[PDB]
């Protein structure tokens with residue numbers, strides 16, 4: 664339902680075929696489904712609607728907490744501890760957000776594999792490449808930092824990668 | 839539970855900043871004190887490490903029964 668956003672967790676249009684029986688023998692599946700729905704789903708719906716109308720009598724809200732964009736570790740002096748603390752907290756929050764992004768992409772890939780059945784190898788190419796890109800970016804950002812990671816270590820890794828990339832680019836341009 | 843037993847994150851955040859500032863100031867003060875102690879012991883021009891010298895008020899500035907002292 665509308666409990667979540669369909670754009671971040673997309674699903675195919677969910678096409679299903681119509682029953683076209685070739686035999687007049689009664690279908691046990693349909694009779695069992697009727698018995699199940701009558702004997703289970705109706706009391707469950709009644710109880711749930713009672714609970715929902717009880718909830719509607721007392722309604723309150725909770726809000727998503729918003730954070731500002733404080734200066735990052737690149738805009739902090741060498742021994743300025745306050746700006747360092749601010750940047751470190753912001754970097755850790757961004758790290759958590761990136762972890763959840765990777766989680767979302769992984770959930771998309773798992774759902775694609777389960778849904779597509781025997782065609783998952785061909786019908787889940789877009790999800791596979793999305794996960795490949797996201798995992799590559801995550802590995803470039805945070806891999807090999809180890810325990811006691813910090814914004815400074817990530818910055819040093821990024822600087823080393825940028826130096827290597829610039830050296831390779833200038834060597835290629837020297838041809 | 840949060841209302842009865844805990845506070846907001848801003849309190850802990852700003853207390854952490856205050857503690858960090860105090861500790862960083864203490865560290866810089868300790869390093870500065872060590873450097874100052876080293877300099878004063880090396881040179882002796884500061885208030886510290888002032889070893890005693892003979893008081894000049896003990897000198898007798900009077901004729902000494904001999905003109906050449």
Ligand SMILES: CCCCCCCCCCCCCCCCC[C@@H](O)O[C@H](CO[C@H](O)CCCCCCCCCCCCCCC)COP(=O)(O)OCC[N+](C)(C)C
Nearest residue numbers: 721723839840841842843844845846847848849850851853
């Ligand atoms: C509607 C609820 C349904 C579910 C019920 C859940 C049950 C949860 C109850 C279990 C409580 C677990 C114990 C944890 C206590 C936390 C102690 C401390 O952290 O809290 C203090 C808060 O004080 C509380 O009053 C603590 C009182 C709890 C005392 C526990 C004793 C229970 C023992 C009972 C044994 C039976 C006795 C009879 C013997 C025969 C903090 O002091 P303070 O810095 O000021 O407040 C800061 C936060 N403020 C400013 C927002 C208010």
